[PDB]
């Protein structure tokens, strides 16, 4: 997604 960063 471009609106939110990846979660870890």
């Amino acid at each position: 997604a471009v609106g939110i960063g990846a979660v870890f």
Partner: antibody
Amino acid sequence: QVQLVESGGGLVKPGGSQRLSCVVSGLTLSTSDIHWVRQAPGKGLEWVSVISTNGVATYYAESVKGRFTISRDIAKNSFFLQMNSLRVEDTAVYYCTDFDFWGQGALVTVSS
Amino acid sequence: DVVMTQSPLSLPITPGQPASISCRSSQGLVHWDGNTYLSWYQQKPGQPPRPLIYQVSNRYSGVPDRFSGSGSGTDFTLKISRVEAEDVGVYYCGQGAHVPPTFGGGTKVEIKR
């Protein structure tokens, strides 16, 4: 095109369970985490849960920890929110979303 | 959690006139990947949020160029250069840099006629 098709909304007694499903088409699921975000009637947006592209990392809003569980069946491009021990304050329209694209929403009403 | 403060809560406006909505975050919004994840959404009654702006200033496809986003650090602004009657609805900012993702409280844009 991208569509997130939701189902499973409805009326539940307090303490009951609902399962929401979200079928994703047209979205590359290897590069977008899948989230659930809810909106109580007349209120704003509140993030509920996330599952990572890797299918292992999950996180939850404090208000639903221990009660909600997010999961997926990647083979069917499907994502699920299992909502247990529901409370009246959980009443809301629930959206599955990757933040770029949003499902149509599913209303969950918790009432006696 | 990142607190997102939106201002004003209500914005009545005549079509053809400009509008400006402020969003202030309690922390910086730079993700590990280097991007700044501040988004703006438009929501009409009975519809899901429509994403208008991603990463501070980038319009999602098909969004009219009368919408523009700016800002940095903790201070951000959505501007509508000239409002149209179809812009009526509730606008939200949101951050996607820190878990949990959080949203502003909304600004209700009302059209004067």
